[PDB]
Amino acid sequence: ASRLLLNNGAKMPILGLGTWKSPPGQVTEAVKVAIDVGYRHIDCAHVYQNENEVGVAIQEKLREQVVKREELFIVSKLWCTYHEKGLVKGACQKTLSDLKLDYLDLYLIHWPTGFKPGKEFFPLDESNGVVPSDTNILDTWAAMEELVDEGLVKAIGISNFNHLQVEMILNKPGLKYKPAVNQIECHPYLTQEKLIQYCQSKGIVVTAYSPLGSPDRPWAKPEDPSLLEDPRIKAIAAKHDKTTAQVLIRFPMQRNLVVIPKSVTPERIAENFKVFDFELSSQDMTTLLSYNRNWRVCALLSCTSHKDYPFHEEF
Numbered sequence: 001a002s003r004l005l006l007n008n009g010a011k012m013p014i015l016g017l018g019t020w021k022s023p024p025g026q027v028t029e030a031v032k033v034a035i036d037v038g039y040r041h042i043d044c045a046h047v048y049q050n051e052n053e054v055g056v057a058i059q060e061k062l063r064e065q066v067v068k069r070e071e072l073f074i075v076s077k078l079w080c081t082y083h084e085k086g087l088v089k090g091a092c093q094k095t096l097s098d099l100k101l102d103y104l105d106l107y108l109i110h111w112p113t114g115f116k117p118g119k120e121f122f123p124l125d126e127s128n129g130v131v132p133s134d135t136n137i138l139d140t141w142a143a144m145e146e147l148v149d150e151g152l153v154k155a156i157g158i159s160n161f162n163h164l165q166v167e168m169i170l171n172k173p174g175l176k177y178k179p180a181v182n183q184i185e186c187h188p189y190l191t192q193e194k195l196i197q198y199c200q201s202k203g204i205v206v207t208a209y210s211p212l213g214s215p216d217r218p219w220a221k222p223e224d225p226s227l228l229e230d231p232r233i234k235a236i237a238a239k240h241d242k243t244t245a246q247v248l249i250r251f252p253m254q255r256n257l258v259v260i261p262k263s264v265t266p267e268r269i270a271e272n273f274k275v276f277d278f279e280l281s282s283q284d285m286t287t288l289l290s291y292n293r294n295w296r297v298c299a300l301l302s303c304t305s306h307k308d309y310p311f312h313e314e315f
């Protein structure tokens with residue numbers, strides 16, 4: 001609709017605002033603008049280094065009475081250096097302090113890979129490569145389940161998990177809470193048909209990240225393709241009197257996915273909201289799906305030898 005039903009009975013808004021790469025100095029205004037414009041879902045993470053400033057915006061709009069807490073859907077994620085059972089609660093509480101909230105609507109395991117705990121987000125050894133933790137996914141899931149029982153979070157989920165990693169959790173002896181959501185990279189160049197079908201069959205809601213192809217990703221090359229500039233996608237947009245961004249945001253919505261485009265620009269934040277007033281035809285949808293090239297923008301290349309690296313499996 002405008003909201004999808006999760007397995008805990010809560011409704012998740014189908015459109016949310018992304019905050020990765022949003023500078024601390026600009027993200028407070030961006031969130032304020034988003035809330036005014038009508039966004040009710042914000043995607044956060046400790047690793048984005050801007051939760052405090054996102055929290056400032058949320059507090060201002062709650063105090064102004066523009067929104068009530070219950071109408072907001074706030075998401076954050078447990079970083080890889082906090083997968084140890086004894087660290088999960090502390091990480092969640094830090095995020096809660098920064099955002100200035102008493103609960104999260106949804107808390108995700110950010111990546112299936114655990115790293116060595118410490119101050120560095122990507123701890124490195126003497127040579128090449130990230131230092132892994134010997135923790136596994138099931139022990140981390142058990143720690144996440146405790147967060148629900150303690151009232152710190154309403155729902156728990158996963159991000160960048162392949163179907164075998166999802167299976168692992170679903171077959172966990174004594175599984176108490178199923179993952180509500182799997183947040184994955186998804187756009188016309190990486191359509192994820194198999195993983196999406198798999199998750200939806202298990203009652204797991206899929207959130208599509210990098211829906212515009214993350215043009216501001218720090219490792220972008222000038223030779224790299226651009227979704228926003230694809231003349232085939234421009235042509236569909238022109239047919240509907242919409243922008244290519246609007247088409248790219250509407251696309252996942254019609255696949256029953258939640259989508260979280262990032263912007264710090266008030267005019268683009270507003271433009272990205274205007275996606276409820278048109279429909280892509282079944283022809284448009286089939287055509288957009290045909291553009292798949294299995295091109296993955298977020299491949300976590302420093303973790304390719306990690307025992308839990310998600311992207312060796314087909315899906």
Ligand SMILES: NC(=O)c1ccc[n+]([C@@H]2O[C@H](COP(=O)([O-])OP(=O)(O)OC[C@H]3O[C@@H](n4cnc5c(N)ncnc54)[C@H](OP(=O)(O)O)[C@@H]3O)[C@@H](O)[C@H]2O)c1
Binds near residue numbers: 261
């Ligand atoms: N779970 C995970 O591992 C994971 C990984 C990656 C991302 N995410 C989440 O997904 C969010 C979205 O992905 P993303 O940040 O990679 O990139 P994205 O949303 O695909 O693209 C963001 C870029 O597109 C620009 N943009 C936004 N609206 C536009 C419009 N209407 N017209 C032209 N350009 C527009 C933004 O510019 P301006 O900001 O300058 O306006 C920014 O440079 C993230 O912020 C994060 O919340 C999660």
Ligand SMILES: O=C(O)Cc1c(Cl)cccc1Cl
Binds near residue numbers: 020048110298
């Ligand atoms: O994990 C994320 O959400 C975004 C991210 C970060 Cl913060 C750092 C390196 C790579 C990537 Cl994809």
